[PDB]
């Protein structure tokens, strides 16, 4: 009958459907409406990167992220570089901090979605929750989770 016109950009304010999504009171389990990326980036994902300065003989692979705080400044407990190469190219694995364990991948950074921040992250550092590789965390959220003490909760 009677037709009117209202743009969808006026309703985008009501996009979040819960307290967790509107006020960010917890981890965004792949349910995030508003994203904040650096002004100028076209490929919309966050990047936790490392600096390579030498050969694997002098500079180890985990020493690339030494400029970051946390467990990347310690040597890992497990090392898979020697022997049969991992199918997913996991080079190192740090000690389990509660339900989270930090891994380092080989090759170009794989773009995954951290369930705590909700952002697509491209990095070689992946924190797996309870050995379940469906729930991964970027290294930044991993360091923040350990700092607050929420390692066994999130």
């Amino acid at each position: 009958n009677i037709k009117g016109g209202v743009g969808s950009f006026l309703m985008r304010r009501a996009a979040p459907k819960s307290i967790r999504q509107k006020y960010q009171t917890g981890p965004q389990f792949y349910k995030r409406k508003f994203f904040q990326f650096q002004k100028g980036h076209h490929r919309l994902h966050r990047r936790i990167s490392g600096v390579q300065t030498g050969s694997p003989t002098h500079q180890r692979e985990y020493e690339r992220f030494h400029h970051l705080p946390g467990d990347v400044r310690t040597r890992p407990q497990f090392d898979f570089t020697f022997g049969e190469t991992r199918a997913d190219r996991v080079m190192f694995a740090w000690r389990k901090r509660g339900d989270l364990q930090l891994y380092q991948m080989s090759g170009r950074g794989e773009t995954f979605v951290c369930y705590r921040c909700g952002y697509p992250v491209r990095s070689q550092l992946v924190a797996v929750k309870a050995d379940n590789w469906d729930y991964r965390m970027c290294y930044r959220c991993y360091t923040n989770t350990v700092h607050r003490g929420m390692e066994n909760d999130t």
Binding site: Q38, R47, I48, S49, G50, V51, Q52, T53, H66, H67, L68, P69, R140, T143
Partner: peptide
Amino acid sequence: GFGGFGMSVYTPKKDRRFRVQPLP
């Protein structure tokens, strides 16, 4: 390290100048 979490990283050209030897 001067890296930080929010700051982006770059690949600096390795310094290949001739360095003086350390002393006791």
